[PDB]
Design a binder for this molecule. Structure first.
Ligand SMILES: [S]
Ligand SMILES: [Zn+2]
Length: 259
């Protein structure tokens, strides 16, 4: 440690020293054992309403890049599934690897994907993001896996702006991006109660992990690997492998929306 990161000296195995909740009872990510996940017919279909989404900016925060959305009103929301209430989209970001064989946070039957997209939403009953993180049902994160295959056209606008936010603290205007181009065809999912996967690791997330991965091209993922963890004019450390390994499931059941 000193500030946390993904290196040898401040990586996930060290987080517990500054954030004791790292060894909590509802930590994320986890491995999804498909044969043990319970089909639950009481789960409703997810409802994604992203047609009025307003993207604002893209920022390199030193551990990933976030695309942020205007969440001052009910423009891009998620509801249904295992959720009660309306969850507003605030930001999305990815986790990726130094090689195609790793990168995702969640695994499926121990399979790791090249990357993992997180769409972050907060429960509107709490009024703001900072209050939602303090509640057991404060956030809803939709996780989508990426496999390397064909290019994903709806991801290119993202890939193209990375050069302008190469180093930590850099940001760029990023209006009119439509997150609908990042969804797979099927919205079948697994769900379980967990946490944020970076410090502060708060246990306030209802995870909704989609069964169907989207494919990206190798060239697309390559550009992610060109970003830097460091700030401008500091020694160069490529932003790769910014994923936390799977944590113990403990007393939790993974439910499936399908069989
Ligand atoms: S995350
Ligand atoms: Zn994440």
């Amino acid at each position: 440690s000193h500030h946390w990161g993904y290196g040898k000296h401040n990586g996930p195995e060290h987080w517990h020293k500054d954030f004791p909740i790292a060894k909590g009872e509802r930590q994320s990510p986890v491995d999804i054992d498909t044969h043990t996940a319970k089909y639950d017919p009481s789960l409703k279909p997810l409802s994604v309403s992203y047609d009025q989404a307003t993207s604002l900016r893209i920022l390199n925060n030193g551990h990933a890049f976030n695309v942020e959305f205007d969440d001052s009103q009910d423009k891009a929301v998620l509801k249904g599934g295992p959720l009660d209430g309306t969850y507003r989209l605030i930001q999305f970001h990815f986790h990726w690897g130094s090689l195609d064989g790793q990168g995702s946070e969640h695994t499926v039957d121990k399979k790791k994907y090249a990357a993992e997209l997180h769409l972050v939403h907060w429960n509107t009953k709490y009024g703001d993001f900072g209050k939602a993180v303090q509640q057991p049902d404060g956030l809803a994160v939709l996780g989508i896996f990426l496999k390397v295959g064909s290019a994903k056209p709806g991801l290119q606008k993202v890939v193209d702006v990375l050069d302008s936010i190469k180093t930590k603290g850099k940001s760029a205007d990023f209006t009119n991006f439509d997150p609908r181009g990042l969804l797979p065809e099927s919205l079948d999912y697994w769900t379980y109660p967990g946490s944020l996967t970076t410090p502060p690791l708060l246990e306030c997330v209802t995870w909704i992990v989609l069964k169907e991965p989207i494919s990206v091209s190798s060239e697309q993922v390559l550009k992610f690997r060109k970003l830097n963890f460091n700030g401008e004019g500091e020694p160069e450390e490529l932003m790769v492998d910014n994923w936390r390994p799977a944590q113990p499931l403990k007393n939790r059941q993974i439910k499936a929306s399908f069989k």
